Scaffold this motif. Structure first.
Motif, PDB file in Angstrom:
ATOM      1  N   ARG A 130      -5.473  -2.459   0.984  1.00  0.00           N
ATOM      2  CA  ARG A 130      -4.844  -1.230   1.450  1.00  0.00           C
ATOM      3  C   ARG A 130      -5.802  -0.070   1.248  1.00  0.00           C
ATOM      4  O   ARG A 130      -6.441   0.033   0.197  1.00  0.00           O
ATOM      5  CB  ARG A 130      -3.535  -0.949   0.703  1.00  0.00           C
ATOM      6  CG  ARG A 130      -2.385  -1.864   1.068  1.00  0.00           C
ATOM      7  CD  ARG A 130      -2.084  -1.787   2.554  1.00  0.00           C
ATOM      8  NE  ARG A 130      -1.682  -0.443   2.971  1.00  0.00           N
ATOM      9  CZ  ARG A 130      -0.461   0.054   2.817  1.00  0.00           C
ATOM     10  NH1 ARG A 130       0.487  -0.680   2.248  1.00  0.00           N
ATOM     11  NH2 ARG A 130      -0.183   1.288   3.231  1.00  0.00           N
ATOM     12  N   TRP A 149      -5.182   3.560   0.512  1.00  0.00           N
ATOM     13  CA  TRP A 149      -4.012   4.343   0.119  1.00  0.00           C
ATOM     14  C   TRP A 149      -3.965   5.680   0.847  1.00  0.00           C
ATOM     15  O   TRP A 149      -2.878   6.246   1.042  1.00  0.00           O
ATOM     16  CB  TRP A 149      -3.992   4.538  -1.399  1.00  0.00           C
ATOM     17  CG  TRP A 149      -3.531   3.313  -2.130  1.00  0.00           C
ATOM     18  CD1 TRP A 149      -3.753   2.013  -1.778  1.00  0.00           C
ATOM     19  CD2 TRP A 149      -2.746   3.274  -3.324  1.00  0.00           C
ATOM     20  NE1 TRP A 149      -3.173   1.166  -2.692  1.00  0.00           N
ATOM     21  CE2 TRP A 149      -2.543   1.917  -3.648  1.00  0.00           C
ATOM     22  CE3 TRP A 149      -2.199   4.254  -4.155  1.00  0.00           C
ATOM     23  CZ2 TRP A 149      -1.812   1.518  -4.763  1.00  0.00           C
ATOM     24  CZ3 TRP A 149      -1.486   3.855  -5.264  1.00  0.00           C
ATOM     25  CH2 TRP A 149      -1.292   2.502  -5.554  1.00  0.00           C
ATOM     26  N   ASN A 150      -5.122   6.194   1.259  1.00  0.00           N
ATOM     27  CA  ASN A 150      -5.162   7.368   2.118  1.00  0.00           C
ATOM     28  C   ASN A 150      -4.467   7.082   3.444  1.00  0.00           C
ATOM     29  O   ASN A 150      -4.572   5.983   3.998  1.00  0.00           O
ATOM     30  CB  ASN A 150      -6.603   7.775   2.399  1.00  0.00           C
ATOM     31  CG  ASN A 150      -7.431   7.893   1.148  1.00  0.00           C
ATOM     32  OD1 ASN A 150      -7.496   6.966   0.336  1.00  0.00           O
ATOM     33  ND2 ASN A 150      -8.060   9.049   0.971  1.00  0.00           N
ATOM     34  N   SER A 151      -3.774   8.097   3.971  1.00  0.00           N
ATOM     35  CA  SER A 151      -3.188   7.985   5.306  1.00  0.00           C
ATOM     36  C   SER A 151      -4.210   8.206   6.407  1.00  0.00           C
ATOM     37  O   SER A 151      -4.041   7.681   7.515  1.00  0.00           O
ATOM     38  CB  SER A 151      -2.037   8.978   5.471  1.00  0.00           C
ATOM     39  OG  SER A 151      -2.396  10.240   4.948  1.00  0.00           O
ATOM     40  N   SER A 179      -5.613   5.371   8.469  1.00  0.00           N
ATOM     41  CA  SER A 179      -5.935   4.294   7.548  1.00  0.00           C
ATOM     42  C   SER A 179      -4.728   3.653   6.882  1.00  0.00           C
ATOM     43  O   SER A 179      -4.910   2.767   6.038  1.00  0.00           O
ATOM     44  CB  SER A 179      -6.905   4.801   6.471  1.00  0.00           C
ATOM     45  OG  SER A 179      -6.450   5.994   5.860  1.00  0.00           O
ATOM     46  N   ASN A 180      -3.506   4.064   7.227  1.00  0.00           N
ATOM     47  CA  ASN A 180      -2.318   3.586   6.531  1.00  0.00           C
ATOM     48  C   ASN A 180      -1.476   2.635   7.371  1.00  0.00           C
ATOM     49  O   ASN A 180      -0.394   2.241   6.932  1.00  0.00           O
ATOM     50  CB  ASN A 180      -1.460   4.767   6.072  1.00  0.00           C
ATOM     51  CG  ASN A 180      -0.984   5.626   7.221  1.00  0.00           C
ATOM     52  OD1 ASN A 180      -1.414   5.457   8.367  1.00  0.00           O
ATOM     53  ND2 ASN A 180      -0.083   6.565   6.918  1.00  0.00           N
ATOM     54  N   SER A 204      -3.311  -5.413   6.676  1.00  0.00           N
ATOM     55  CA  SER A 204      -2.730  -4.253   6.000  1.00  0.00           C
ATOM     56  C   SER A 204      -3.714  -3.101   5.835  1.00  0.00           C
ATOM     57  O   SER A 204      -3.296  -1.980   5.539  1.00  0.00           O
ATOM     58  CB  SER A 204      -2.203  -4.678   4.632  1.00  0.00           C
ATOM     59  OG  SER A 204      -3.151  -5.482   3.946  1.00  0.00           O
ATOM     60  N   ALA A 205      -5.009  -3.349   5.983  1.00  0.00           N
ATOM     61  CA  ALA A 205      -5.999  -2.283   5.925  1.00  0.00           C
ATOM     62  C   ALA A 205      -6.877  -2.423   7.152  1.00  0.00           C
ATOM     63  O   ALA A 205      -7.641  -3.392   7.270  1.00  0.00           O
ATOM     64  CB  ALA A 205      -6.823  -2.343   4.641  1.00  0.00           C
ATOM     65  N   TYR A 207       3.753   0.724  11.470  1.00  0.00           N
ATOM     66  CA  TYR A 207       3.812   1.483  10.240  1.00  0.00           C
ATOM     67  C   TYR A 207       4.084   0.540   9.083  1.00  0.00           C
ATOM     68  O   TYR A 207       4.552  -0.594   9.253  1.00  0.00           O
ATOM     69  CB  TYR A 207       4.893   2.566  10.315  1.00  0.00           C
ATOM     70  CG  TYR A 207       4.586   3.620  11.350  1.00  0.00           C
ATOM     71  CD1 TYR A 207       5.257   3.639  12.571  1.00  0.00           C
ATOM     72  CD2 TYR A 207       3.614   4.591  11.117  1.00  0.00           C
ATOM     73  CE1 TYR A 207       4.976   4.599  13.528  1.00  0.00           C
ATOM     74  CE2 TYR A 207       3.320   5.550  12.071  1.00  0.00           C
ATOM     75  CZ  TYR A 207       4.013   5.552  13.274  1.00  0.00           C
ATOM     76  OH  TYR A 207       3.732   6.500  14.234  1.00  0.00           O
ATOM     77  N   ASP A 243       4.192   3.232   2.165  1.00  0.00           N
ATOM     78  CA  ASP A 243       3.115   3.770   1.360  1.00  0.00           C
ATOM     79  C   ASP A 243       2.860   2.836   0.181  1.00  0.00           C
ATOM     80  O   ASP A 243       3.810   2.309  -0.411  1.00  0.00           O
ATOM     81  CB  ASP A 243       3.450   5.178   0.878  1.00  0.00           C
ATOM     82  CG  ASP A 243       3.182   6.227   1.936  1.00  0.00           C
ATOM     83  OD1 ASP A 243       2.322   5.981   2.810  1.00  0.00           O
ATOM     84  OD2 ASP A 243       3.825   7.295   1.892  1.00  0.00           O
TER      85      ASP A 243
END
Ligand code: HEM
Ligand SMILES: CNCc1cncc(-c2cc(C)cc(N)n2)c1
Ligand SMILES: C[C@H](O)[C@H](O)[C@H]1CNc2nc(N)[nH]c(=O)c2N1
Ligand SMILES: [Zn+2]
Length: 411
Positions: free
Chosen positions: A167, A169-171, A262-263, A274-275, A400, A403
């Protein structure tokens, strides 16, 4: 069953049959429409082969070899690997096809005329957050290309069990920091105030100013994420000046050139990435309207009205509208005069109509989210306002996803 969409500015009609290939559900029913709901509603091996087969069939269809020998063998080959491993691995060619079509199918994206020109960076051999940082830096430097921005996507290893997830974690790879204030207000970007604090939680030292680029928080193989600073020479920034108002510089605004989400989650043949940070170039309004003038973002209509000499007492003076236009002439002009790729909402929406035409002709349709395609200013003087659009969910797709800090089992 073979529906018509009309344009009410040109009277052009197009017939959509692509929606028949649609698989996923929209949120709407026969008795309710959720077209303005923002985000409406472990994977096993039984469910996994239809998704692989459906995808492989369209990939081999695409290279003009539907059902050929190479297809039926790769079909068999992936089935055997879903037996053996209860998952499977995409070919490099399949990964690039899948990614490009996840973009092509992104109904909320007004930029998809460019979908076949996507640089796919295969990072599925990544294993640590340091490797992710390195892959992401290479992505940033490539996609920026000295301001001649190039669209690109970097695809980290696919989800396996669920508790081993890559992941970001940054959007977005590049976002400005948001610090709440001791007087309860906010400096920087109010959107990122929680994420700005999570970085501080993990040890970030914040230069508590405005346009403070955030550090990457990268989680690899489900491990707790780690902070990394993008070398500032890799973060291209455009100072926003107006071509008329020399007090604009005193506003002291700037935005980064690279929009890089990136999210989100890339789905290809039932495999979940997922990333998968992906970047293109900005449409002016994203910065000048949403980023700068959203009430819960930078919220600058205040000062731009002031220095223009505008009647701010009366709501109906449209001082908000007038200051909004100058701000977007300025974002555009600043980027153009710096050779940093940017598209205005007129050119971008004109191209999307053209792209829509091509999709309906050589593909039988184009899933499109009117609520998101129409620009957030001057809607009806762009051609997409007058264009009926069918929204439906094709796969491969970008989805989507929660988070990471709401879902991660820390340690
Ligand atoms: C190349 C130039 C591009 C332009 C001009 C463009 C334009 C836009 C704009 C204005 C939005 C709305 C964002 C928002 O309002 O928050 C959007 C959304 C989106 N774009 Fe495109 N984009 C481009 C490239 C790309 C690329 C390279 C990808 C993926 C490979 C992509 C996938 C998406 C997705 C999945 C969304 C909706 C997800 C979301 O932000 O909620 N775009 N695009
Ligand atoms: C919820 N969407 C988040 C977001 C925020 N800012 C910018 C974008 C964006 C992303 C891409 C690839 C292109 C573009 N022109 N823009 C997406
Ligand atoms: C309520 C509504 O669905 C929400 O504000 C949407 C509207 N359309 C949008 N369109 C774009 N391009 N970006 C957005 O964030 C939104 N937000
Ligand atoms: Zn609906």
């Amino acid at each position: 069953r073979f529906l018509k969409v009309k344009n009410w500015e040109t009277d052009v009609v197009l017939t959509d049959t692509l929606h028949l290939k649609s698989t996923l559900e929209t949120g709407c029913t026969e008795h309710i429409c959720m077209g303005s709901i923002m985000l409406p509603s472990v994977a096993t091996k039984d469910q996994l082969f239809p998704l692989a087969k459906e995808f492989l069939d369209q990939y081999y269809s695409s290279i003009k070899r539907f059902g050929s020998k190479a297809h039926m063998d790769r079909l068999e080959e992936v089935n055997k690997e879903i037996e053996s491993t209860s998952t499977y691995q995409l070919k490099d060619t399949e990964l690039i096809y899948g990614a490009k079509h996840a973009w092509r199918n992104a109904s909320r994206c007004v930029g998809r005329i460019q979908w076949s020109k996507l640089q796919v960076f295969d990072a599925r051999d990544c294993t640590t957050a340091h490797g992710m940082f390195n892959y992401i830096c290479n992505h940033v430097k490539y996609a920026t290309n000295k301001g001649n921005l190039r669209s690109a996507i970097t695809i980290f290893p696919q989800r396996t069990d669920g508790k081993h997830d890559f992941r970001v974690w940054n959007s977005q790879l590049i976002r400005y920091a948001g610090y709440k204030q001791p007087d309860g207000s906010t400096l920087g970007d109010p959107a990122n105030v929680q994420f700005t604090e999570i970085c501080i939680q993990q040890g970030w030292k914040a230069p508590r100013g405005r346009f403070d680029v955030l550090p990457l928080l990268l989680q690899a193989n489900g491990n707790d994420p780690e902070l990394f600073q993008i070398p500032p020479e890799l973060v291209l920034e455009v100072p926003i000046r107006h071509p008329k108002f020399d007090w604009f510089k005193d506003l002291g605004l700037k935005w980064y050139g690279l929009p890089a989400v990136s999210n989100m989650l890339l789905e290809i043949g039932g495999l979940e990435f997922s990333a998968c940070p992906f970047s293109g170039w900005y449409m002016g309004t994203e910065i000048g309207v949403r980023d700068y003038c959203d009430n819960s973002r930078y919220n600058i209509l205040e000062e731009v009205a002031k220095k223009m000499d505008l009647d701010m007492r009366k709501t109906s003076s449209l001082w908000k509208d007038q200051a909004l236009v100058e701000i977007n002439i300025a974002v555009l002009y600043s980027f153009q005069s710096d050779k940093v790729t940017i598209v205005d909402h007129h050119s971008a929406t004109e191209s999307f109509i053209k792209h829509m035409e091509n999709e309906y002709r050589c593909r039988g349709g184009c899933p499109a989210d009117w609520v998101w395609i129409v620009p957030p200013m001057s809607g009806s003087i762009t051609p997409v306002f007058h264009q009926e659009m069918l929204n439906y969910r094709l796969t491969p797709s970008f989805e989507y996803q929660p988070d990471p800090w709401n879902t991660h089992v820390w340690k």
